[PDB]
Amino acid sequence: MKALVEEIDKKTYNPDIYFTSLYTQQEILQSDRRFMELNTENFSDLPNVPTLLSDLTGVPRDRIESTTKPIWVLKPETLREIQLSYKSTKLPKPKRKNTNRIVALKKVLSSKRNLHSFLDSALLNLMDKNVIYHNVYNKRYFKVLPLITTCSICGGYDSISSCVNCGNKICSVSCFKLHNETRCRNR
Amino acid sequence: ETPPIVIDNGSYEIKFGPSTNKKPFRALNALAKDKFGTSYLSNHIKNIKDISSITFRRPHELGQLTLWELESCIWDYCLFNPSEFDGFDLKEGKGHHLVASESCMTLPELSKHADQVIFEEYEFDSLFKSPVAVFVPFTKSYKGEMRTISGKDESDYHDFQLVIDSGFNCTWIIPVLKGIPYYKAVKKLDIGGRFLTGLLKETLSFRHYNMMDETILVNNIKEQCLFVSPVSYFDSFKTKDKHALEYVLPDFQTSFLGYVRNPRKENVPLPEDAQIITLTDELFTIPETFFHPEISQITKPGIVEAILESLSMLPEIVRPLMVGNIVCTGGNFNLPNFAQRLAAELQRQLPTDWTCHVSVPEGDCALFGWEVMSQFAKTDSYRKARVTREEYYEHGPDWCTKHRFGYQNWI
Amino acid sequence: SLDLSALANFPSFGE
Amino acid sequence: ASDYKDVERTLLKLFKKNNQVNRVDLDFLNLVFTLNDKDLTSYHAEEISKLTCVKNFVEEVNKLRETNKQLQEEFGEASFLNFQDANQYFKYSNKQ
Amino acid sequence: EGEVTELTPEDAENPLGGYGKTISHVIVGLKSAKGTKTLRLDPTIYESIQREKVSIGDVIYIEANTGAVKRVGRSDAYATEFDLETEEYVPLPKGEVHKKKEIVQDVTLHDLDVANARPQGGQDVISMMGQLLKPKKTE
Ligand SMILES: Nc1ncnc2c1ncn2[C@@H]1O[C@H](COP(=O)(O)OP(=O)(O)OP(O)(O)=S)[C@@H](O)[C@H]1O
Ligand SMILES: [Mg+2]
Ligand SMILES: [Zn+2]
Ligand SMILES: [Zn+2]
């Protein structure tokens, strides 16, 4: 049943250790980059994320490009495409005249510049950028609901165990085989 | 004299129509191109047959309306064309009252450009624009029909109201105090319908064959069969098989768009050439990212935490009344059981003294914003608050966005 | 009570 | 008897659920009085019985209740409707 | 009854106020299906909490009639905190945190007589040894 007498070596035995045998900044940056990658709609726009994320988060672009592993939009051809789209519309009645304000209107109606340029533009002041992007996010309450961990393969929760190789969670023999064959990253 | 024209300039679809009209129209504001290069505009996207790899281009880059060319193109298509939209025709624009909407946090320069174009390129007589949450308090002025649920059981505007605007871009927590939102308590939850679609993309690409390019297909899949767990994630996972549904993949010879079947209910046999995709866990695990972003490996906080922080930043005396008068709107809220779960989870965190009353409009929740905006447009408050064309001409371009519309006045 | 005095001074859709 | 411990645990767990719910604490209601002889004294017990503070509780309850009556007179028609005023909600919270 | 969210013992404003530890009231926050409530408890209840080994997240049960603290178990919220742990996970209590209920029982007079003759109180060695003894009928 139970051994009332146990042999211990003074050098080896210690209660602090029992043994028998036969987010970091980079991590949160990677997770945020994954979220922004998953946000975009068009697949062709996937490799355009790093510039926008560098503009938003503020980290240098080369650092996110190198350390973090993932997974110029308008032309005169866009004007031609707009011209082809004109055929659907039916009833315009235009007229214009020239002045400085009209020149400004023309510049606005011929921008063809991206949100990255606006964010990088010096006209957007520091506190304006702060309120527009950083202030709206949560700053005090970070997690009030419980933390729920699920199977990385099928989302199950009845049984949970961590794979020996990379430390990610699985739940069953079938999920074990699936992870080992296709999902395991570090091997 | 003419009734005002009301437009909801959403980043995904544009709701518009005369204030006299009962229900608005639709305009999916996006210029799309196919694999072979043919282009489609606005509602013509519904007419595509090769749905496989169509690319969407939109003017709202990240909720901010940047590229004005196509925005003007879709405005022209939606307003001027009378053939498609039931004979409605905006003849000249001059002498027409326009009330619009915009993202609650727009850059001052971008809002300046917006006001400039909408005032001088189109020459409207008067204009009023603000986020939809600003128009929400005016539900008191009309006899609305909105179902409400309390979390503790199984002079033309309301002074205190809290609006949860979950749309395509982001989910907003906008508490409005007597009409002006308390912009310091405005909190942005980055999770939204676009991210929900992307998450469905990734999950379906892993669990089943690669659907990483079928954007409209997955959008329809999200449209037809999705739900938040009525009780909790564990409860839905226990009964995953009972509530399972199967989705019929598109058949180009018979139906350009797919459809969902209920296996339990008796229905017609499928032809043998039809491929079927079963959904057993992605039905509920995808919407759960609103409450538990950790499930999809997202570091961002959830909706309940955002609401709690927004309440915290509010003045102490008004925050319980703000809790009691929370109203939900936006495209995402029409998926079943979201309002009930929001109410229950919010009540579980508040002190027992307070009670939360959650009211969500019936029917398509996307049309609610336009409805309340139009009903506000036909009130004396709109007559007082509107800015006239000559008044705009009197001031510099920055004046309108810095004083009468934009957040720069209330910050 | 004084918070109510502070609250009543908030803008009410005017300026 | 070591092999029978699991059965004992199962049976005790089965019985506790019904035992705990619908029982009246006889110790609380002074129905059990055989331990009192060990730690209590006759004159001390009778003095504590004489020195009970029911009157203070009743007078404080009546004072609070008359304050509530005055507050209800000031407020008027009380209702549990959805709150749109700080004054009304604050007064209702004070009442509750 | 509810799930423990906070436990913040407070000391007296002055060290001379009390003896030894000089422990004042304890503040406990309980969570239920209908909300949360912050309670102010006597130091005796704090001692009971310590005896029952209650930590944050455990579902507890306090009787204001007697001052008895019971540990129902661990909340289902923290079910997946550890993949292997011996804890009786229980759901969050329904209703309000502070529920008042009227309990009615039918008991015979012989039940009261037996309760007085063989009381179950006491945690001494003698008390436990008597508990182990057979319950022989007595006059
Ligand atoms: N039945 C539905 N189930 C789930 N999602 C839906 C459903 N119907 C519509 N949606 C989504 O709801 C959104 C509708 O867009 P809106 O709520 O109108 O946002 P928007 O106002 O157009 O753009 P914003 O305001 O700048 S975020 C889209 O993301 C749709 O995919
Ligand atoms: Mg919208
Ligand atoms: Zn699994
Ligand atoms: Zn692994």
**Distance from the CA of B10 to the center of ligand 1, in angstroms?**
9
Residue by residue, DSSP assigns chain E as -EEEEEEEEEE-SSGGGSSTT-EEEEEEEEEETTEEEEEEE-HHHHHHHHHTT--TTEEEEEETTTTEEEEEEEEGGGTTSSSS----EEPPPPS-SS----------HHHHHHHHHS-----SHHHHHHHHS------
Instruction: List the structure tokens of B48.
Output: 């595509």
Q: Whose CA is closest to B17, among B379, B370, B395, B385? A: B370
Instruction: List the structure tokens of B315.
Output: 């003045």
CB contact under 8 Å between B294 and A88, yes or no, is no
The minimum-distance atom of ligand 1 relative to the CA of B365 is: 17
User: Do C and A touch, counting CB pairs below 8 Å (3 needed)?
Assistant: no
Closest chain B residue to A112, measured at CA: B67
Return the amino acid letter for E29: G
Q: Whose CA is closest to B197, among E64, A39, A14, E42? A: A39
- Pairwise CA distance, residues B126 & B347, whole Å: 43
Instruction: List the structure tokens of B268.
Output: 């017609």
What is the maximum alpha-carbon separation in chain C? 25
Q: Is A39 helix (H, G, I), strand (E, B) or coil?
A: helix
CB contact under 8 Å between A90 and B66, yes or no, is no
Element (H, E) at A162: strand A161-162
Strand order in the sheet with B55-57: B39-41, B31-33, B55-57
Q: Confirm whether residue A43 is marked as ligand binding.
A: no
Cβ–Cβ under 8 Å, residues B178 and C10:
yes
- For chain D, say whether C2 makes contact (Cβ under 8 Å): no
Residue A169: DSSP 8-state: E
- Pairwise CA distance, residues E70 & E1, whole Å: 9
Residue list, CB under 5 A from ion ligand 3:
A 151, 153-154, 156, 171, 175
CB contact under 8 Å between B305 and A109, yes or no, is no
Q: Name the one residue in this structure whose structure tokens are 């024209």.
A: B5
Q: How long is chain C? A: 15
Q: Whose CA is closest to B224, among B193, B195, B261, B192? A: B261
Closest CB from D24, D27, D35 relative to E103: D24
Which range marks the domain in which residue B224 is found? 193-289
Cβ–Cβ under 8 Å, residues B109 and A121:
yes
Closest CB from A52, A118, A155 relative to B107: A118
- Pairwise CA distance, residues D42 & A68, whole Å: 81
Cβ–Cβ under 8 Å, residues B56 and B215:
yes
Residues linked to residue E8 through DSSP beta bridges, in sequence order: E27
Breaks (C-N over 2.5 A) in chain D follow: none
Using a CB-CB cut-off of 8 Å, the residues of chain B touching A23 are 299
- For chain A, say whether B52 makes contact (Cβ under 8 Å): no
The CB density around residue B312, as the number of other CB atoms within 10 Å, is 13
Residue A131: DSSP 8-state: I
Q: Confirm whether residue A88 is marked as ligand binding.
A: no
What's the start-to-end Cα distance of chain E, in Å? 42
**Distance from the CA of B3 to the center of ligand 1, in angstroms?**
28
Q: Is A161 helix (H, G, I), strand (E, B) or coil?
A: strand
Cβ–Cβ under 8 Å, residues A50 and A63:
no
Subunits in contact with chain E (3 or more CB pairs closer than 8 Å): A, B, D
- Pairwise CA distance, residues B105 & B184, whole Å: 12
Q: Whose CA is closest to B15, among B333, B406, B400, B368? A: B368
Using a CB-CB cut-off of 8 Å, the residues of chain C touching B316 are 3
Minimum-distance ligand to the CA of A166?
4
Minimum-distance ligand to the CA of B195?
1
Using a CB-CB cut-off of 8 Å, the residues of chain D touching B324 are 82-83, 89
Q: Which residues contact B80 (CB under 8 A, 6 or more apart)?
A: A89, A90, A91, A92, B89, B90
The CB density around residue B285, as the number of other CB atoms within 10 Å, is 22
Q: Which residues contact B384 (CB under 8 A, 6 or more apart)?
A: none
Q: Whose CA is closest to B5, among B120, B86, B101, B72? A: B101
- On the 0-12 / 13-18 / 19+ scale of CB atoms within 10 A, B252 is exposed
CA dihedral A78→A80→A84→A90, nearest 10 degrees, is 90
Using a CB-CB cut-off of 8 Å, the residues of chain B touching D90 are 317
Instruction: List the structure tokens of B378.
Output: 């036909």
Query: What Rg do the C-alpha atoms of chain B give, in angstroms?
Result: 22
Residue B353 to chain D, least CA–CA distance (Å): 8
Closest chain B residue to C2, measured at CA: B317
**Distance from the CA of B214 to the center of ligand 4, in angstroms?**
30
Q: Name the one residue in this structure whose structure tokens are 């990734």.
A: B202
Instruction: List the structure tokens of B292.
Output: 């538990």
Using a CB-CB cut-off of 8 Å, the residues of chain C touching B140 are none
Residue A177's Cα: distance from chain center in Å?
A: 28
CATH, residue B204: 3.90.640.10
Resolution of the entry in angstroms? 3.3
Q: Whose CA is closest to B300, among B190, B167, B185? A: B190
Query: What Rg do the C-alpha atoms of chain D give, in angstroms?
Result: 26
Question: Burial code of D79-93, b = ≥16 C-beta within 10 A, e = fewer?
Answer: eeebbeebeebbbbe
Residues linked to residue B357 through DSSP beta bridges, in sequence order: B150
Instruction: List the structure tokens of D37.
Output: 């002889």
Best of A132, A182, A183 to disrupt the B interface by mutation (most B CBs within 10 Å)?
Answer: A132
Instruction: List the structure tokens of B147.
Output: 């179902």
Q: Confirm whether residue A179 is marked as ligand binding.
A: yes
**For E68, how many CA atoms within 13 A lie in the half-sphere containing its CB?**
8
- On the 0-12 / 13-18 / 19+ scale of CB atoms within 10 A, E105 is exposed
Quickly count helices (H) and strands (E) in chain A: 8, 2
The CB density around residue E31, as the number of other CB atoms within 10 Å, is 23
- Pairwise CA distance, residues B56 & B52, whole Å: 12
- Pairwise CA distance, residues D68 & E129, whole Å: 56
Strands (DSSP E) contained in A14-150 are: none
- Pairwise CA distance, residues A164 & A152, whole Å: 14
**For A140, how many CA atoms within 13 A lie in the half-sphere containing its CB?**
10
The method recorded for this entry reads: cryo-EM
Q: Which residues contact B222 (CB under 8 A, 6 or more apart)?
A: B193, B196, B197, B200, B286
Residues linked to residue E41 through DSSP beta bridges, in sequence order: E26
Cβ–Cβ under 8 Å, residues B57 and A44:
no
Element (H, E) at D65: helix D54-75
Cβ–Cβ under 8 Å, residues B299 and A32:
yes
Q: Name the one residue in this structure whose structure tokens are 């209107």.
A: A105
Question: Burial code of B232-241, b = ≥16 C-beta within 10 A, e = fewer?
Answer: bbeebbeebe
Q: Confirm whether residue A171 is marked as ligand binding.
A: yes
Q: Dihedrals φ, ψ of A21, to 5°?
A: -155, 165
Q: Whose CA is closest to E18, among E27, E9, E28? A: E9
User: What is the SS3 assignment for chain B?
Assistant: CCCCEEEEECCCCEEEEECCCCCCCCCCCCEEECCCCCEEEHHHHHHCCCCCCCEEECCECCCCECCHHHHHHHHHHHHHCCCCCCCCCCCCCCCCEEEECCCCCCCHHHHHHHHHHHHHHCCCCEEEECCHHHHHHHHHHCCCCEEEEECCCCCCCCCEEEEEEECCCCEEEEEEECCEECCCCCEEECCCHHHHHHHHHHHHHHHCCCCCCCHHHHHHHHHHCCCCCCCCHHHHHHCCCCCCEEEECCECCCECCCEEECCCCCCCCCCCCCCEEEECCHHHHCHHHHCCHHHHCCCCCCHHHHHHHHHHHCCCCCHHHHHHCEEEECCHHHCCCHHHHHHHHHHHHCECCCCCEEEEECCCCHHHHHHHHHHHHCCHHHHHHCEEHHHHHHCCHHHHHHHHCCCCCCC
Strand E58-63 and strand E2-11: the pairing is antiparallel
Residue E96 to chain D, least CA–CA distance (Å): 15
**Distance from the CA of A171 to the center of ligand 4, in angstroms?**
12
Q: Whose CA is closest to B44, among A77, A45, A79, A89? A: A89
- Pairwise CA distance, residues B178 & B158, whole Å: 7
For ligand 1, residues with CB inside 6 Å are: B 10-13, 63, 103, 167-169, 193, 219, 222-223, 226, 330-332, 334-335, 366
Question: Burial code of B348-384, b = ≥16 C-beta within 10 A, e = fewer?
Answer: bbbebebbbbbbbbeeebbbbbbbbbbbbbbeebbee
Q: Which residues contact B333 (CB under 8 A, 6 or more apart)?
A: B164, B166, B339, B360, B365
| CA dist A44 → A37, B55, B213, E55 (Å) | 12, 8, 10, 52
Q: Which residues contact E108 (CB under 8 A, 6 or more apart)?
A: none
Q: Whose CA is closest to B219, among B7, B56, B65? A: B56
Sign of CA dihedral A72, A73, A77, A78: negative
Cβ–Cβ under 8 Å, residues B13 and B29:
yes
- The shares of helix, strand and coil residues in chain A, as percent rounded to the nearest 5, are 45, 0, 55
CA dihedral B302→B304→B308→B309, nearest 10 degrees, is 20
**Distance from the CA of B174 to the center of ligand 1, in angstroms?**
18
- Cβ-defined contacts of A150-156 (< 8 Å, 24+): A150/B295, A150/E80, A151/A175, A152/A179, A152/A183, A153/A178, A153/A179, A153/A183, A154/B281, A155/B237, A155/B281, A155/B285, A155/B295, A156/B237
Minimum-distance ligand to the CA of A154?
3
Q: Phi/psi class of residue B179: alpha, beta or left (left: φ > 0; alpha: ψ in -120 to 50)?
A: left
Interface of E with B in 68-87 (CB under 8 A): 76
Q: Is A170 helix (H, G, I), strand (E, B) or coil?
A: strand
